[PDB]
């Protein structure tokens, strides 16, 4: 039989290994701030296209949290406009801000944004390993530090803020970034979807079909990537309100048939590609639109 020539190529698709936390909801670490335990994002890969929908609201989640005379419901999730102003900060403002730091000034924009957010000290607690997550916007080139690290409050019992993670069309240029986003995510993490490609398993010198797949309609690639994201690794279950940490285990992958408009979703790590011209290979981490 043939040895697997897909090994290096396929490494970035071992989401359990390279991301290692939830995707839909990422809360894979714990940390104390001022005598209080908190769950927080800890995923090592950027989540392309992810944001938060606030339910029963017109206000965007990148809006600063309510402060002063503002009520919690009129604000969003972002750091409030205090001075010196650390958020929102553009790429070039960040590059300038860190200009005398050889490492930080040369980081890619997503890692830079993540490291910038990571320099905020929560309640000025230096005993704390807690670090805020961030959202990077490709269009404006803005890093928004998130004050609220919660990603879902969907409990029908009283659904205060009701909200959910989503890949909305208006979030396409956004990337959700945990404190742990790695330097070399471009080499080790998914980004663009794969044309002329279908994820499979290497068996007896050949790429074989993923044996267990759930199939749903999806009119385009973006709809399929959304469905995969909805089923992906998650560190809290939907509508809730440790064994609650996914560690990147989940329905993280999808094979998209562009011709039959079928999204084929699975929870086992792929080890090769089948080259089928009807298919695009997508991941919950991947950009919702971009193809390679």
């Amino acid at each position, epitope marked *: 039989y043939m040895g697997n020539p897909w090994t290096e190529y396929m490494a970035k698709y071992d989401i359990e290994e390279v991301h290692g936390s939830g995707i839909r909801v990422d809360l894979g670490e714990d940390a104390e701030v001022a005598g209080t335990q908190y769950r927080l994002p800890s995923g090592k890969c950027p989540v392309f296209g992810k944001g938060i929908i606030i339910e029963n609201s017109n206000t965007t989640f990148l809006t600063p949290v309510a402060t002063g005379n503002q009520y919690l419901k009129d604000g969003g999730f972002a750091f*409030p406009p205090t001075e010196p102003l650390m958020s929102p900060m553009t790429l070039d403002e960040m590059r*300038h801000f*860190y200009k005398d730091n050889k490492y930080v000034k040369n980081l890619d924009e997503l890692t830079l944004c993540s490291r910038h957010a990571g320099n905020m000290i929560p309640d000025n607690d230096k005993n704390s390993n807690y670090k805020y997550p961030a959202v990077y916007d490709d269009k404006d080139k803005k890093c928004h530090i998130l004050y609220i690290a919660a990603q879902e409050n969907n409990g029908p019992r009283y659904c205060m803020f009701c909200f959910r993670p989503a890949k909305d069309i208006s979030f396409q240029n956004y990337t959700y970034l945990s404190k742990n986003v790695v330097d070399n995510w471009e080499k080790v993490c998914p980004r663009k979807n794969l044309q002329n490609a279908k994820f499979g398993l290497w068996v007896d010198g050949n790429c074989e079909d993923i044996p267990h797949v759930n199939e749903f309609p999806a009119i385009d690639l973006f709809e399929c990537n959304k469905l995969v994201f909805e089923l992906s690794a998650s560190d809290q279950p939907k509508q809730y309100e440790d064994r609650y940490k996914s560690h990147g285990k989940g329905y993280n992958w999808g094979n998209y048939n562009t011709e039959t408009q079928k999204c084929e979703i699975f929870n086992v790590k792929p080890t090769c590609l089948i080259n089928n011209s009807s298919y695009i290979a997508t991941t919950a981490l991947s950009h919702p639109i971009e193809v390679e």
Partner: antibody
Framework: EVQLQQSGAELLRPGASVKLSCIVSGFKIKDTSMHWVKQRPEQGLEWIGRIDPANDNSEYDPKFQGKATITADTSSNTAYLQLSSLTSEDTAVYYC?????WGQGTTLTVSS | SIVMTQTPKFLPVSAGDRVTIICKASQSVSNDVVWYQQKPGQSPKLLIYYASIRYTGVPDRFTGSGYGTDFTFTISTVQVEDLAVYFCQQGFSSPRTFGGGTKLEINR
């Protein structure tokens, strides 16, 4: 929240010395250089020097060597400007900066 | 020591005129030039960095341009709020020397 706080106004006699402080809260300074700027009454801005809090690598305008000493401490997130051999020439507002963000300044008056 | 020669020292303008301030570097400072606004009694605030990039929140009337030695700062139409002293600074080499400043007078 991030805050910059400079020490209080200082009145001192000639020949003396002073340690000015620049306390940053809510932000780790190690990644960011910290600068001190001098402005004499009704005059222009003068760069004294800066410190790289990571290396403790500080540099100066040659005019201020042996007069100005800039230090930082990453565990307290605080920067300091030490001024030697005080003189009427040293009467000025002293700004500290967290990179490109400026403090409110400290007024130094040097007089007998 | 790189000298940054700021011109002019004093500039009277009517509310609506164009303001043009020039800063001449004695050596090449690439694009590493910042422009500051200091209003009476306040700390300088950064308006333009890397010679031509306007900081967020800074009004669109404020603009900077240039590369090498020749750097120019423009207020397209000066307003009453703009009464301040303006400074260039180079950050390309230490000492990071300031220009001598430009103090505006609002003509009326």
């Amino acid at each position: 929240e991030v805050q910059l706080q400079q020490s209080g106004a200082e009145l001192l006699r000639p020949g003396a010395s002073v340690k000015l402080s620049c306390i940053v809260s809510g932000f780790k300074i190690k990644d960011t250089s910290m600068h001190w700027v001098k402005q004499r009454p009704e005059q222009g801005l003068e760069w004294i020097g800066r410190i790289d809090p990571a290396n403790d690598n500080s540099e100066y305008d040659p005019k201020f060597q042996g007069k100005a000493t800039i230090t930082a401490d990453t565990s307290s997130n605080t920067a300091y400007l030490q001024l030697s051999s005080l003189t009427s020439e040293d009467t000025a507002v002293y700004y500290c900066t967290l990179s490109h963000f400026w403090g409110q300044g400290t007024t130094l008056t040097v007089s007998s | 020591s790189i000298v940054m020669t700021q011109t002019p020292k004093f500039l009277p303008v009517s509310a609506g005129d164009r303001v043009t301030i020039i800063c001449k570097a004695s050596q090449s400072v690439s694009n590493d030039v910042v422009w500051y606004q200091q209003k009476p009694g306040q700390s300088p605030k950064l308006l333009i960095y890397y010679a031509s990039i306007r900081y967020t929140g800074v009004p669109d009337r404020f603009t900077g341009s240039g590369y090498g030695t020749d750097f120019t700062f423009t207020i397209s139409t000066v307003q009453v709020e703009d009464l301040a002293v303006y400074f260039c600074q180079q950050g390309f080499s230490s000492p990071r020397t300031f220009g001598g400043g430009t103090k505006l007078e609002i003509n009326r």
